[PDB]
Amino acid sequence: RTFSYTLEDHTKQAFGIMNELRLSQQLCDVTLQVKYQDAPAAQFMAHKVVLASSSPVFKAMFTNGLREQGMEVVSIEGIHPKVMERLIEFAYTASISMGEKCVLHVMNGAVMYQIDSVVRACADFLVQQLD
Amino acid sequence: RTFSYTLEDHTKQAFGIMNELRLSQQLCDVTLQVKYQDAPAAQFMAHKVVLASSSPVFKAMFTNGLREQGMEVVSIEGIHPKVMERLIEFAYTASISMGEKCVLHVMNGAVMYQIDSVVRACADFLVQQLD
Numbered sequence: 001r002t003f004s005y006t007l008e009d010h011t012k013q014a015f016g017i018m019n020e021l022r023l024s025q026q027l028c029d030v031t032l033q034v035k036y037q038d039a040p041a042a043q044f045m046a047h048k049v050v051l052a053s054s055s056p057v058f059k060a061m062f063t064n065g066l067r068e069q070g071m072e073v074v075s076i077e078g079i080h081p082k083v084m085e086r087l088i089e090f091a092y093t094a095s096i097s098m099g100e101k102c103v104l105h106v107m108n109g110a111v112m113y114q115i116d117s118v119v120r121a122c123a124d125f126l127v128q129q130l131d
Numbered sequence: 132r133t134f135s136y137t138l139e140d141h142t143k144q145a146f147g148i149m150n151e152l153r154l155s156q157q158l159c160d161v162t163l164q165v166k167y168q169d170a171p172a173a174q175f176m177a178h179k180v181v182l183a184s185s186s187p188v189f190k191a192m193f194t195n196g197l198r199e200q201g202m203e204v205v206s207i208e209g210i211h212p213k214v215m216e217r218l219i220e221f222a223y224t225a226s227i228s229m230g231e232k233c234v235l236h237v238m239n240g241a242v243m244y245q246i247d248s249v250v251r252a253c254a255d256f257l258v259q260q261l262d
């Protein structure tokens with residue numbers, strides 16, 4: 001009677017395309033302007049719904065009961081553009097890479113945007129460096 | 132040197148929230164108006180980027196090199212609202228359920244929007260009913 005089916009890696013497939021659309025700057029509805037001290041400013045286009053799905057801070061930031069028209073620019077301060085890139089990548093790919101020296105700055109970014117899995121990851125790594 | 136990390140079920144987690152946002156009608160940028168013969172019209176709000184990630188037909192339908200302002204209404208004909216609901220659900224949940232009698236109508240919808248995994252699923256099921 002009730003025929004049901006589930007594609008295992010659909011979400012991984014869909015995020016692949018959603019990442020392709022980001023790199024192609026198609027359907028993006030938010031531009032993240034990152035300005036950090038002495039580093040040059042950098043823009044990052046993305047989809048609010050995707051960022052919200054990976055960061056409770058973005059979710060609350062975009063869920064204001066309003067269908068904002070067209071593009072919305074968000075001014076981000078206190079984080080290095082390099083770091084914001086890795087976090088966006090993680091949101092669209094569920095993965096993140098970096099050098100040992102920037103792990104701490106990524107942890108700060110993960111905390112600032114409450115991306116727990118990244119926080120816990122950098123936490124356990126830093127503890128392993130000890131001794 | 133190069134510290135990398137990957138959260139396995141991130142995409143499943145993110146789609147959970149993206150589905151929550153749909154049911155809450157937050158960040159949606161497309162309304163699918165479905166009108167089918169004698170059945171009453173039905174609306175379905177969703178996120179273009181999500182639909183595009185699961186349907187090449189939606190991807191081409193929304194990727195026209197334009198950041199359309201606010202909400203866009205799409206007139207859909209030739210498919211029953213019940214069927215469009217299941218397909219949207221699959222896009223946001225990677226799963227789909229239905230009764231034996233409507234499996235064929237879902238296959239028609241999956242084909243119409245080139246959601247291969249659903250097409251192949253209903254295909255193999257119908258072949259199993261035989262004999």
Ligand SMILES: *C1=NO[C@@H](c2ccc(NC(C)=O)cc2)C1
Binds near residue numbers: 082
């Ligand atoms: C990895 N995390 O931050 C990057 C970085 C870039 C440039 C500097 N230079 C000064 C003066 O701050 C430090 C750290 C590297």
Ligand SMILES: *C1=NO[C@@H](c2ccc(NC(C)=O)cc2)C1
Binds near residue numbers: 211232
């Ligand atoms: C499952 N697929 O389509 C649904 C349905 C609803 C209403 C009717 N009635 C007429 C006259 O077409 C048939 C099929 C059921």
